Amino acid sequence: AWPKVQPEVNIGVVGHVDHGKTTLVQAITGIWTSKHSEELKRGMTIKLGYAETNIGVCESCKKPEAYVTEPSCKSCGSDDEPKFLRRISFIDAPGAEVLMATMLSGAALMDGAILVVAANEPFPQPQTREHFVALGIIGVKNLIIVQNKVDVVSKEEALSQYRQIKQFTKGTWAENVPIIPVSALHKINIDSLIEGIEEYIKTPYRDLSQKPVMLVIRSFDVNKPGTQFNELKGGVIGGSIIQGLFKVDQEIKVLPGLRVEKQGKVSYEPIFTKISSIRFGDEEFKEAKPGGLVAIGTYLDPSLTKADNLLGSIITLADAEVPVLWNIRIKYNLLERVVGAKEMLKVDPIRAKETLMLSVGSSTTLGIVTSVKKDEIEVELRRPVAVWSNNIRTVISRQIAGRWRMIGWGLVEI
Ligand SMILES: Nc1nc2c(ncn2[C@@H]2O[C@H](COP(=O)(O)OP(=O)(O)NP(=O)(O)O)[C@@H](O)[C@H]2O)c(=O)[nH]1
Ligand SMILES: Nc1nc2c(ncn2[C@@H]2O[C@H](COP(=O)(O)OP(=O)(O)NP(=O)(O)O)[C@@H](O)[C@H]2O)c(=O)[nH]1
């Protein structure tokens, strides 16, 4: 048998709209990540999608077919049980250009990524470029490029695009990134991709001694109709542990917390609760480490967590000291041009009184620029952000021609 363990690594799946990200995650895991009504009706990813799978290898078989996602080697002609390697998970991003902020929130959770490129579309499409640039900025450099939909192009066409992809990465941080051709729809060469994931997206070192921090991307009311009181539960908060670890029965807090009134002014009150349960996928555990998206059960009124209310928050231990800032100072750099537009225009300098969009951890916040210098801006935010470490990465977007566009990045200075 294979052990039941949490996933130990998060692999992002990014790329231009409809290039096959969600279908690729389904080919690997058997799971369709889209769970929302609007997603099913529109046939698109809107919220971050999630799926897990075990990975093993049949030691008597040849590679790549030796790599499997279930405890059988019958497919490669062996009655032996495959050796368990690890459990992995996928963060499935939306490709829609209007949803770049959601992609950015997901990239904060990624240990590595797959950039999906459709073989039957011109290269490089706007969000092929934009998601690529985003990965570089955020530092998700453990990248595999997947050439998808090879089932609907000729070998000559696939090879032509392959050369253009290598020339695109030439002279960049991604110069040595592998390109793996697949058909996600027809599950062709998926075993080669699994081998690639093992080779190029290793599980990173973790620091379990660091103060526990979870970035929140989901929150739920888990109570269903037709249930007895015996099985009813408090609110559930979902996200990624980025350092340390959490345990059942630990006192925790949600930051910045709840928007309330205090002294005639808007304030955020830290939400204190206790961990009632820990789940990854369909399995319960007593503790949670980095890797995977964890569901933290709490004793909170489920009305506090319903419908992703706490998206963008962080969770820490109750006694942790974490800055919660209404005003932030950013040591920044600007991109040369707007890479996500159909026509890439020059990026204008930041000006005082501009409204910018700031991506910090899983959070997305608008703010007004109150100060500009050569290397530094100060921003007054509409909602405070939890800043759990010094020099956390932020991504800066500007509204250009009616769309939020990534224009730069920086370090939040505390
Ligand atoms: N021929 C072919 N079609 C594919 C392949 N992979 C995906 N498609 C098709 O491409 C369409 C989009 O697939 P989807 O996985 O939803 O793409 P996406 O990149 O997740 N879209 P979004 O950016 O909106 O999340 C679907 O009709 C799907 O069946 C493939 O390998 N071959
Ligand atoms: N810690 C913990 N997580 C749970 C518990 N029950 C469900 N979850 C997690 O919460 C998420 C949603 O649960 P699920 O029952 O699948 O769907 P749901 O509760 O109907 N959510 P929604 O109403 O948003 O559809 C999943 O990630 C699941 O693993 C629980 O008792 N404890």
Ligand SMILES: [Mg+2]
């Ligand atoms: Mg999708």
